[PDB]
């Protein structure tokens, strides 16, 4: 409960223990919002550097492609190019859930490097990436495609990954993606996403423009930017095939390479993740006149609609088929309703996350009666900003690219009941004794999507915010 | 679908037939996958001698490391110094990674900052990072001391660490009493606990090259005590009780203890402990330096010793038996202390836990991996407990370092079947653990999918994986655990036992089958 | 047959084709056995609500027991006293039981003697037993003191003995100074834990019924500690170091922690350590009496209120947060000293702890036994874990105490599902298990044949135990652990939590099946 | 040690004693001398323990339910009286079985009558006709019942053989009372005699004199293998090898129909002579069945075991028992060429029960091995003749040795290995004495037979052997 001049008074005291100009950077960084102004571009910036010393919260271009993008893709070999760093940190730490028989047909949970040493950055590593290509075809010979993951020192010392992969593609008749998402380049993940669609689009997308032996129907969609955590991508296809659509391709959770080949074959792209996959949405449109439509299936207000308005592009028998799987669901996301809801209602939430789901998820926490209070995204462009001030309450507290000390100072004023974020978060604010849910590794439960994964959001918000253990935190003596 | 009193989470809700058959779907339509008996060919290949050959012939591609890069050691060094802030001059990305490695394996906050270097700054370098980088870590975080290191964008483009920081001072971005030690610590050379030695002995220099003329060796009457790369909060604990226990004065130099256990009461503390300022500046001052890591801790030896002129003594890992014997005896005759009738008796303690589990340890094969200084210690410790440690496997190890091993199983019968590799990672793993099938792996997390690989081949050929290294994700506070001295000793040695019999329960626990041996007393 | 290099033990010799066919052979000519359908059926209907009924309908049949008899306890504690030696008045075959019971679960030696009575003595009495009995045990084995308890046979023939040890002083078999305490112990009263009562009841009368008008309470500054029938060395060892770091003066009457606990150094020593006569004669003059486990000690609370005059604090035994917090405010009230750091900063680590894994805890389902205050502070602190304790046996149990702990379940929405059982068995629990199925069972090594017999049903139906209590023959060491104050808590959460991820971890390894979820980060 | 030095330890360690103690124990401590023979002439057995000197021994419910009755597999075993006794022996003793257990089978379970005061206050009889029943209801297969009386029960003058008499009619079972009490006799030796005895009253007598069974003339008894480990397996595999069929084993995995059938067999196979020597003799007396004496320990006893058993036979039994003999022969030489080496010499101690005592030593002089002293907790006279001559000259035995005696002989003795029981493990293990458990083998066997000689030397080196022995001693001392 704070009104807009509490707020912005608050922004200006945090600020007073900056230098000059890291004040005056971070200041356009936060803002109330206001729904007397509509455009992100009168009121906040974002997608610029961070400052030096700040404590960003943000990752890399290489996180944004391999990490985000290409590592889900479960029936090809993801190269780390580079030191061991890069690759052993970003081993497994993302629950991109995918079917397959690790090490022999899928390699989403294995770390594969050149594992660069100063020899490799004196005389290059492009003669090492072409054995090691070798290698990795004589030991996995069932993999479908490599890509070539390039880590800092790859384009710091001239070395020619396109040349390495166009010639290794040849000889092997094999798909050989270069992805030159070098940690150094653009101010965050978010680079690593275009980069990372504008490999796809080069090295991959095109192989089938000439091909016809694929057997269409009206109803064949993609799922376009769902990363299936903790399976989030199943939870929301069930419901597309259960509402009649025929879902060819899930990018890229859970995701092969044949059904990224495939889809610009669909009907319509149904786009989840804006932020990271909106370039090859506007590419498939313009080139193979694939439309494309932003949804949401966090929570069942957003879920229903969604559904309403994916049917709404197909005929009278996919709208009946819709109308059906919401009478389906509706006395299970009911139940979880009437048990849980009573139990969160009030409650104020801030979250900070990525690209997404920092406005995504908010109506669900409208669902379970919660109020988002504030929110943030690392990495999330003014565009994000649009949508997020339409699903943000009058005067609550937006902040982008938040320092660690920013965070901790918002927090301690605003005293949330909860707070969703991430792993560099989430041990601070326990012992703040503020209950913390993971909201981008969903604290290793999940799916949060669609209406089965509602019942599982719903559970994790109420076991922590009404648990024990933060009753006990001050000592009886003192 | 769910029953909202029993809801499924992720497991085993895609186990209900509508997302299994929508599953099946899913594969047949549109993912052109191989077919399974290809899939079973293939898999039965991957655990064969000739696979392994081929395995073993690798040498550009390298699969499932077991070793990190040298900054998140320079951090973790850095964090054990009093209200220090862990810096890394260079792109942000990696002090992201560095962060979450930490906070998933000790369940805690883990501070370090970036000064956010950017394609721009590769082309006219990170001087004006540093300057504003400095200013605003120093004035936004209010530590006492900030700890600077590198990610490889810096070292490639050559940024000069020193030349940089001494700018800031010189045009006032902060303090010139401020310090501000740092190291080169480039990610294409060595591996993280190479960063951990960098930093130490960076910060070693800063505070006592310039100063060493009052200097006089033994004059505080303590001794030095240089962990390393130490990931067990039991670890820091154990060493500075035994040292109090005997009475002898002491000095511990990075000891992130505190700060990586705050108590949950309401408020976060960036900073907690620490080693302080003055006790480095003091260093010298002590009879003597003990590096409990020496094949990890080269540099910061040649500095204590060509600079501080200390003689630091030939000891092992204080692992095990003869090496905590060997180490207190040690510290017996430096400082003058008698080994104390408390720790003679938690010696005989273990000994006594030897001879009461040692007919289920005997004989006993397992593989592990770790660093080089834990490796050798869990090596020889398995060898006094009459285990046969099979498959020894070190990728950041170096020849010097094997062939010491090496000397260590040639003294014991329980050495003739184990081999020592170097250079090598988990895949390569994967393979002596299917062509030579120990009992039990010793790992960290990364083990689990080994495990997973072997149960795939049929129960009888799996391998259990127990948890003991660096880092530990999957279970819930073993970082708080020992592994040195005699209490690790202890420790380790149930941990080794009960996982036997845990899996002996297991495999005589079917009814009227195999319970003719599930025995209540074991 | 046997192959040299690759020797089997029974499991899994018994295995080979040649011994299950003759195994077979025997059953199928000699044994006259019911056809496997026939068992398979029956096992079935044991798995019924129906059986259950009849079960729960037992009146005069006891089937596994949780509980033994009374002189194990006295035994176990005399064995806290200064070179004390336990002498079980009786016939000789009980003390060969209660010393293997002992060996089996602290895997050390267990002194104690018997006097050897035979069927003669139903005629005359066992005075001359008892002459030459401690005549001889005081010459042989050298103790200070000797603690006399009964076997049930004395019992029920009659025998006095306050006036039997009276005429072995008189006769001159044994000094008269020499102590002899001594209490009444029949195995058909109560359980174990009485046993200890009664016998710690007589320890304290003996010095200090005839000595009390001396004495002035408060006059030493200490409190008494009296930690009943207790089998972990660490809870020992935490409440004398908890007091320690308060400046808390104390006498922790009865503490057999060092002679179960000697070191394997070359010398086997029959006693160590212990509660001194001193102590128990000076303990009137405490501050007052703390009883670690008030359910068993109802005698000694009326001694002590009755005799020495303290006012017995009424605290729960010191397991979880709540009781710890409760036991060390009590504490600082009668002492006057303050809560220390040391202490509040492990309490706080110890919320971290519950902070960190309160996710997979959450909503947990147990089945529990053991002895009545380990289970209610087991029960308290899982509802303080947000688990849910549905299955509270305590065989030894009664009406107060059950009230009590319905009580506590009732201030918790975490007790909604639980139920207290009295007087029940772990057959009866057995049945529990397979109606009202939990996620895992906390008890003695007995529940490893309750989790064969779910597994026997099917996989999904498997309770996995978790091993914390008394005995534990099954695993080796886990005597030493502490389940009381922080240290406690910690260890029993660190154990449940990381007892869920093992087995998720277990039934998330199956490839392209379960290990979708076989998640490297927990 | 010499002669004259063992008779000085011996009164050296007597000095501690009050008079009384010293003159009895005496008795029971002798040196082997080849010159005397016969036991009676020089050493006292199978009398009562001297008060508070901490015997080893257990009492004669221990010998009738844990050693007789507790392992035969189908039928439920009541322990009659308070808690203790049944917990105390529930699954300490590894005598193993093949069953569902619960269903068909029941040895690891503890069934109890759990006395109460009032119980004894009025008598347990009414009790224990309603637990007879509560059993029937809950466990429905199994084939036969007995109570083993814990002391309480003759003390008060409840009278156990009326219920079993009455209930057994009424429900048309085999229910068998067994005065056992633990103030009975003077160890578990007579618990043994009063097992043997309920077997012939209630179970031969009861259900064993008529036949429809198909006879062969290679039919015999396993008389005295509890199966501690699989013991009676790795025994029972080599006879039926050899040509014969075993019809039963008394009592490990022993079902009480092959108990029965045993009146049938032709020859009854005894290895533990001690505690079923006396159905034995019964058998003998009323069926015309010989028994012999066997010895499953090592290759050389059960060579020759196995060529005394076959002789009994024909000459198609004896051409069998070559062909085995033959077959293992690799096997066991294997054995002893790895494992005598790294044994030979070396000396050892034992103290176990009324038959370990001798019938291992040949398994340990197969590996080269010494014994050098040994004793029973319960052996009579004539275990003490057939153990004279199975030790060397001039060594030391004990007859129900006091802990102060064992410890005291072994300081002065200093073996390399001693072999006792769990009582015994933990004292010598802190001297620095490696320790093997001789009753539970360490929870490692079988040690019968050739595949138990195996396991026995394999265990025996790794621990004579192991590397903690050399670290008891810290180099600051
Ligand atoms: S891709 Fe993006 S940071 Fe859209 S880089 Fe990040 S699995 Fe976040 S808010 Mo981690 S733009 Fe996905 C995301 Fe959102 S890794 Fe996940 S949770 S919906
Ligand atoms: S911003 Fe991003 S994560 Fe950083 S390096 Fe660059 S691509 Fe990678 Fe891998 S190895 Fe280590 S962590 Fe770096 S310093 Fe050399
Ligand atoms: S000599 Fe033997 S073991 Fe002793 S009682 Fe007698 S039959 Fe039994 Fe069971 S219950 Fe306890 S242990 Fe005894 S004192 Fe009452
Ligand atoms: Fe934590």
């Known amino acids: ?478 | 679908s769910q029953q909202v009193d029993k809801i499924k989470a992720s497991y085993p809700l895609f186990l209900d037939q509508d997302y299994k058959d929508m599953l099946a779907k899913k594969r047949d339509g549109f993912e052109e996958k191989y077919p399974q008996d290809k899939i079973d060919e293939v898999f039965q290949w991957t655990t064969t001698k000739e696979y392994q050959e081929l395995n073993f012939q690798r040498e550009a591609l390298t699969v499932n490391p077991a070793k990190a890069c040298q900054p998140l050691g320079a951090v973790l060094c850095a964090l054990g110094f009093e209200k220090t802030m862990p810096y890394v001059h260079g792109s942000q990305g990696c002090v992201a990674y560095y962060r979450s490695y930490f906070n998933r394996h000790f369940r805690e906050p883990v501070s370090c900052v970036s000064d956010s270097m950017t394609e721009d700054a590769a082309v006219f370098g990170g001087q004006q990072n540093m300057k504003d980088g400095l200013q605003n870590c120093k004035a936004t975080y209010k530590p006492d001391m900030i700890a600077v290191s590198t990610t490889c964008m810096a070292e490639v483009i050559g940024d000069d660490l020193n030349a940089f920081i001494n700018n800031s001072k010189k045009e006032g971005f902060i303090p010139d009493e401020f310090p501000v030690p740092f190291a080169h610590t480039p990610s294409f050379v060595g591996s993280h606990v190479t960063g951990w030695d960098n930093m130490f002995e960076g910060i070693a220099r800063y505070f006592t090259l310039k100063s060493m003329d009052d200097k006089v060796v033994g004059s505080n009457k303590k001794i030095n005590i240089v962990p390393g790369f130490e990931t067990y909060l039991g670890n820091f604990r154990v060493i500075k009780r035994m040292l109090s226990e005997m009475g002898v004065g002491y000095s511990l130099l990075s000891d992130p203890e505190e700060v990586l256990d705050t108590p949950a009461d309401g408020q976060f503390r960036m900073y907690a402990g620490g080693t302080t300022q003055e006790e480095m500046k003091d260093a010298p001052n002590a009879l003597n330096t003990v590096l409990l890591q020496p094949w990890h801790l080269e540099k910061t030896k040649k500095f204590v010793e060509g600079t501080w002129k200390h003689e630091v003594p030939k000891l092992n890992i204080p692992m095990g038996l003869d090496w905590t014997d060997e180490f207190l005896m040690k510290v017996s005759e430096i400082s003058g202390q008698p080994i104390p009738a408390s720790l003679t008796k938690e010696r005989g303690r273990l000994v006594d836990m030897m001879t009461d589990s040692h007919t289920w340890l005997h004989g006993k094969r397992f593989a592990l991996w770790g660093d080089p200084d834990f490796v050798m210690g869990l090596v020889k410790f398995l060898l006094e407990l009459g285990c046969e440690p099979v498959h020894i496997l070190c990728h950041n190890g170096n020849k010097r370092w094997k062939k010491a091993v090496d000397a260590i199983l040639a003294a014991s019968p329980y050495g003739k079947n184990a081999t020592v590799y170097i250079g090598k990672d988990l895949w390569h793993l994967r393979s002596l653990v299917f062509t030579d099938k120990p009992d039990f792996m010793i790992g960290n997390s990364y083990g689990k999918f080994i495990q997973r690989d072997t149960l795939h081949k049929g129960k009888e050929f799996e391998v259990p994986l127990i948890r003991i290294g660096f880092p530990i994700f999957d279970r819930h506070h073993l970082h708080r655990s020992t592994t040195l001295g005699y209490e690790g000793a202890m420790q380790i040695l149930t941990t080794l036992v009960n996982s036997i019999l845990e899996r002996l329960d297991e495999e005589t626990r079917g009814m009227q089958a195999t319970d003719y041996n599930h025995d209540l007393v074991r």
Not at chain 1, 124 to 151: R, Y
Not at chain 1, 205 to 216: C, Q
Not at chain 1, 253 to 274: A, F, M, Q, R, W
């Open chain 1, 1 to 478: 409960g704070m009104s807009r001049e509490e707020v912005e008074s608050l922004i200006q005291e945090v600020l007073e223990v900056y230098p000059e100009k890291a004040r005056k950077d971070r200041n356009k960084h936060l803002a109330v919002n206001d729904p007397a102004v509509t455009q992100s571009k009168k009121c906040i910036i974002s997608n610029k550097k961070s400052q030096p010393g700040l404590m960003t919260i943000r990752g890399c271009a290489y996180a944004g492609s391999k990490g985000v993008v290409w590592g889900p893709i479960k029936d090809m070999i993801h190269i780390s190019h580079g030191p061991v760093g890069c690759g052993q940190y970003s081993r497994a730490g993302r629950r991109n859930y995918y079917i397959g028989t690790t090490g022999v047909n899928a390699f989403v949970t294995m770390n594969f490097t050149s594992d660069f040493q100063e020899k490799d950055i004196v005389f290059g590593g492009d003669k090492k990436l072409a054995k090691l290509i070798d290698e990795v075809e004589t030991l996995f010979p069932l993999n479908k495609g490599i890509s070539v993951q390039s880590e800092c020192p790859i384009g710091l010392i001239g070395d020619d990954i396109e040349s390495v992969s166009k010639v290794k593609g040849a000889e092997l008749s094999k798909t050989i993606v270069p992805v030159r998402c070098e940690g150094f380049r653009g101010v965050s993940q978010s680079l690593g996403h275009h980069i990372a669609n504008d490999a796809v689009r080069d090295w991959v997308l095109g192989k089938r423009d000439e091909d016809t032996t694929f057997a269409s129907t009206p109803y064949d969609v993609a799922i376009i930017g769902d990363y299936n955590i903790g399976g989030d991508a199943w939870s929301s296809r069930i419901l597309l095939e259960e509402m009649g659509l025929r879902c060819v391709a899930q990018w890229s959770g859970d995701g092969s390479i044949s059904e990224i080949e495939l889809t610009p074959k669909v009907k319509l792209n149904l786009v989840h993740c804006y932020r990271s996959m909106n370039y090859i949405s506007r590419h498939m449109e313009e080139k193979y006149g694939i439309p494309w439509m932003e949804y949401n299936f966090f929570g069942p207000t957003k879920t229903i609609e969604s559904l309403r308005a994916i049917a709404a592009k197909f005929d009278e028998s996919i709208q009946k088929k819709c109308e059906e799987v919401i009478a389906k669901y509706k006395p299970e996301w009911e139940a979880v309703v009437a048990k849980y809801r009573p139990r969160l209602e009030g409650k104020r939430v801030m979250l900070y996350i990525g690209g997404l789901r920092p406005r995504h998820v908010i109506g669900a926490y409208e669902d379970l009666g919660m109020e988002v209070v504030g929110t943030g995204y690392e990495f999330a462009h003014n565009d994000d900003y649009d949508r997020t001030m339409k699903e943000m309450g009058d005067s609550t507290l937006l902040y982008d690219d938040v320092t660690g000390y920013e965070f901790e100072e918002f927090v301690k004023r605003i005293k949330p009941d909860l707070i969703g974020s991430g792993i560099k978060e989430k041990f601070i604010f326990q012992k703040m004794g503020i209950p913390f849910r993971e909201m981008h590794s969903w604290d290793y439960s999940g799916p949060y999507h669609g209406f089965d994964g509602f019942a599982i959001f719903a559970r994790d918000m109420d076991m922590t915010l009404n648990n024990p253990c933060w009753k006990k935190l001050q000592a009886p003596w003192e």
